[PDB]
Symmetry: C3
Subunit: 206 residues, 3 copies
Amino acid sequence: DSTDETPASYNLAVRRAAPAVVNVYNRGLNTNNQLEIRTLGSGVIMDQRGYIITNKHVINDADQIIVALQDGRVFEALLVGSDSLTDLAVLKINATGGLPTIPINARRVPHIGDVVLAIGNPYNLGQTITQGIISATGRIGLNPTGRQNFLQTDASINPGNSGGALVNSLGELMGINTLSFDTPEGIGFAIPFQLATKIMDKLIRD
Amino acid sequence: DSTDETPASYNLAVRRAAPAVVNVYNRGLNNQLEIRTLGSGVIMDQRGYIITNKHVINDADQIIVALQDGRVFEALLVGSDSLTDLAVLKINATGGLPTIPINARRVPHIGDVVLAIGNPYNLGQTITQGIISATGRIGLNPTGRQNFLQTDASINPGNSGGALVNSLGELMGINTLSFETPEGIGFAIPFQLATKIMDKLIRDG
Amino acid sequence: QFDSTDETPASYNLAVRRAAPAVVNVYNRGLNLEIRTLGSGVIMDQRGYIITNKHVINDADQIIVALQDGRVFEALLVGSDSLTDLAVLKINATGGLPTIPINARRVPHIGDVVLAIGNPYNLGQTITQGIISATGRIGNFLQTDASINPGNSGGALVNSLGELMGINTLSFDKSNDGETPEGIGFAIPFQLATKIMDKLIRDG
């Protein structure tokens, strides 16, 4: 009997990284004052100060930006500033009790073939974990993405996953999910965590 | 001279669980039998009781069950529950039956590797790999329920009533009809819930 | 938190480094000069023979093959098989080529982790991961839920050791109720593929 064996699992990665991936809500204003949900995506808490990376397209033209953590807290987020060049954006929240932060190993080098998990909020179903591998680590020549430094992955990505996290089996941030190529299957992209940290730092000081 | 490096494989879980997952066919009369809908099913014990999805065997004149070893039986409807979309069948076989491995003490964790086992598009038994994406929801959500297993192991029509197992072959849940163009978003009833439902059908009906 | 600095990430990078250098981008060019169709191919042996998709190279004026190391060659068509959708190309072997690892005594098992290697949508070589979903599919075929897209045809399906399991063909296309099938692709088993190649080489 298997009663004593151990099921293969990436649960250790989920427990390490998941608590820091938040649900981002873009609220508009209904014709018939009250606020409705225009768009929604994911986001990631980078440090204790309360900074959060997310997608620009998710927060554009937002009357109110709402951020929901997996522990049930809900904050209103301030727009720190977006990047027109890399499609990122940085939010800020004012929390009292301390925050969960995404693990970051600045010395880790993502390799093609590494198992990765996508973490986000597809179709507003609640936080979801999907599993894939890094399919590519940037491109040298000209290619359909127009950029040379995108991580590609086949971890399923859907509307709502944008601005969310892509971690490896250790729960270390590999990148930030963007958009999914659209009848394609298992083709998604992420901004490398190195580049994302630089863009954030810049948007924060500036 | 030739070394014994072995490739990563979830074949152990397949050899353990797969034999107990069956292709379920629903027959109709045109005055000659023919297939109307098909799906998957799971053999729960030696007596020959099988779990499948209710909608798969709705209004069926003859239910047929095909095992992976090539045996084919006629099955009898024992009961059905609309609330949980679960149905139970019964087959009478001479030899022994392959039963799905169950560990009532195992608890499904988010991130566990899982295999979906069923008969998609009637291609024969297919096995696809993914992980547990979620183990239910506390809040109100678009599925309308609070106890669905969500998995990103590919689920297609014909997978309903089939088995979601872990890397050990242990039943985690029963796959149900999955969810404009979503990718890697499927659902299953938790195995604990399913078993309880089945027992009620067998005796109560 | 915790220090994962010395922990090791689960990875199939060993398989990539072994098999990927031998999976090339195939381009069907036509006069108009331009690119008409494109797929993938696999370098089998040092003689410069490559397996690919019959539909990728059909009605081609100039077949081009592109290795990942930057080299680009002009391939000649050795012959194609009507029955199996496999085609064989031949390039200049001078200079040494990367070859796909082959273990002729390895038996694919249902549940084996496999990696597909090809050129989906001309994004550049892409690696996807799945498992052997089934064997001996007659419509012999390996089935796999390693994501396949247009461009993957004629590319490689290899296990975690990087050994060749089969050559990718097309996906499943039949929509039951106006829906899109997911994680269903097929591949000519590596045993059969080798025989087809040998026979096409021999018949040419």
